Design a protein around this nucleic acid. Sequence first.
DNA 1: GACCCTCCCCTTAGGGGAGGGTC
DNA 2: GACCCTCCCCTTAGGGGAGGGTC
Lengths: 276, 276
Amino acid sequence: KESYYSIGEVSKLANVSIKALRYYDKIDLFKPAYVDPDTSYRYYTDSQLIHLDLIKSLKYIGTPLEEMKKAQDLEMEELFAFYTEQERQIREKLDFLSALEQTISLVKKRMKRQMEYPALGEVFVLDEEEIRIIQTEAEGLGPENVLNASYSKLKKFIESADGFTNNSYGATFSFQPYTSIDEMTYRHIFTPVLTNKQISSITPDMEITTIPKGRYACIAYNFSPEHYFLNLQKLIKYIADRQLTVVSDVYELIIPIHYSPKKQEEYRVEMKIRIL
Amino acid sequence: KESYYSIGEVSKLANVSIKALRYYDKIDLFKPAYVDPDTSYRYYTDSQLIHLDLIKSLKYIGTPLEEMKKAQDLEMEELFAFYTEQERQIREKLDFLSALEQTISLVKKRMKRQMEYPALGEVFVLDEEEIRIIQTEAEGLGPENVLNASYSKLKKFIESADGFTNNSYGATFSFQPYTSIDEMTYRHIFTPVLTNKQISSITPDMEITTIPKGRYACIAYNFSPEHYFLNLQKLIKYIADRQLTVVSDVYELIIPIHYSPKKQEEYRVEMKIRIL
DNA sequence: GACCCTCCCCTTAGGGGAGGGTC
DNA sequence: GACCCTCCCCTTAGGGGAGGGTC
Ligand SMILES: CN(C)[C@@H]1C(O)=C(C(N)=O)C(=O)[C@@]2(O)C(O)=C3C(=O)c4c(O)cccc4[C@@](C)(O)[C@H]3C[C@@H]12
Ligand SMILES: CN(C)[C@@H]1C(O)=C(C(N)=O)C(=O)[C@@]2(O)C(O)=C3C(=O)c4c(O)cccc4[C@@](C)(O)[C@H]3C[C@@H]12
């Protein structure tokens, strides 16, 4: 009333740190009513304690301090407007997050699916849910000469609307009685999508399409160049012997087993191909 | 394939800034496969481009970099677990925000209500929705000697569970034919609550209770010491003349008109009191 | 030219000290 | 002792330069 509080008093009363109060002092956001010229001690009137209500609340919603300053000079109506503005900012974040939460949930679904492949090396046949992807003409690209840099555009679009890139890399090709990997060329390289956000200015050389819900002859193994071709052969054989008919191209996905640059690279490969 | 990308190439391919790549280099998160000893130029193999998928995605969800490091060495299963952990962190933020969004919406409702008081200075009678508050014994505290520091404990609890403090300050007293502000003493001082989060270790000297839904004789004005008492008198008179019966104490709320420390302080005052 | 280098300063909002003089 | 002072270093993840030597 007829005295000042010293900074410690104010700090206990307002549950704000001393270091905080000295800061707010520095930045002319909250300044002691009076400062002893000899001890440079800070002293605060009781009535001025009220300006902390606003600072503490804005701080809680996380308004930057320089913002708070321009906040103080607001009329009750403009303060209303300002709050409305926060409501907007928030709702934006809530959307971002509901989205994020789902994307992750799905990434997890896919990862699990891969940690459950019944047999590596063996040809299992199974029923698969639809997979949406974005693909693009593979212009004379075999397994032998394809690079990560080849995925640069696809990646750019997908991550530009999914925000998530860590993923698996895809390729399709014609099912033939290949006798040599030398004979192989990809029709498309592709990359799966995780969101429904619309890619923004998608150019015509990208096709958005999917891997149809259907029944697939699959095979999946950890990568090694010996095994790559010979496993493909396992598959062609599986179909040969069971006289199955194919209704799609061979799909091929390579997903990394880890991303530590300290261990030798290792990749899970999965070839599947739809049948009637 | 049989060459390196220079940092600019990698930057365009992976849509990551050069300054970013030099940083990741510094912190041994991503390092060029090779560094020219003479030009200190950075050079990156195509195959190592894959470690950016993970970094870019973690960055999107906003994992700190030192975290990403310990992320890299994870097995596909532990990476799963890690993601689950993010799902937790997020859901936490989504809650925080749905909460925040509501609190604000309500603050706005109250503010509006105050920018619509039909007449300042005049005694309007009206129907009011319930107001939840937290109050505490006012120990020999009149209008004449009450301080902001008096609200220190209430404030602490309410903000400890509401996160929002900027507010209005309350007091109640007995409705009497007062002849002098000298004669006035508050029964309680109080402060409204905005959340339903439970105050955590609430001590018994606080009572959580509310201002009942009911019909109230109100009066509200911008503060000035001349007017304070004389307006209270206006109210006592209103009731006298209409022979109304009172079923509650006088409630009194002071909310600030602005929080700029640059203008002369100004407060909206509102006295209301319930009737049959 | 175009491209890359290191090195330096700047960005929030204070928290943690050290070392001094205080109520 | 308890309390307060200034002053200094440290915390993310780089962006923006300046000034040098490059492909
Ligand atoms: C585009 N694609 C399907 C694969 C890819 O982009 C990869 C990647 N980004 O991780 C593989 O590492 C991928 O680049 C990769 O590792 C491949 C190979 O190195 C080989 C080699 O050396 C010999 C035979 C077959 C392959 C291969 C078909 O598995 C190659 C697949 C490549
Ligand atoms: C607790 N309460 C209801 C009010 C309060 O805490 C205030 C605040 N924190 O802003 C008022 O400024 C409050 O502290 C305040 O301003 C009050 C006063 O200064 C006076 C004076 O000087 C003379 C008569 C009446 C009042 C008064 C009743 O309006 C006082 C109300 C005070």
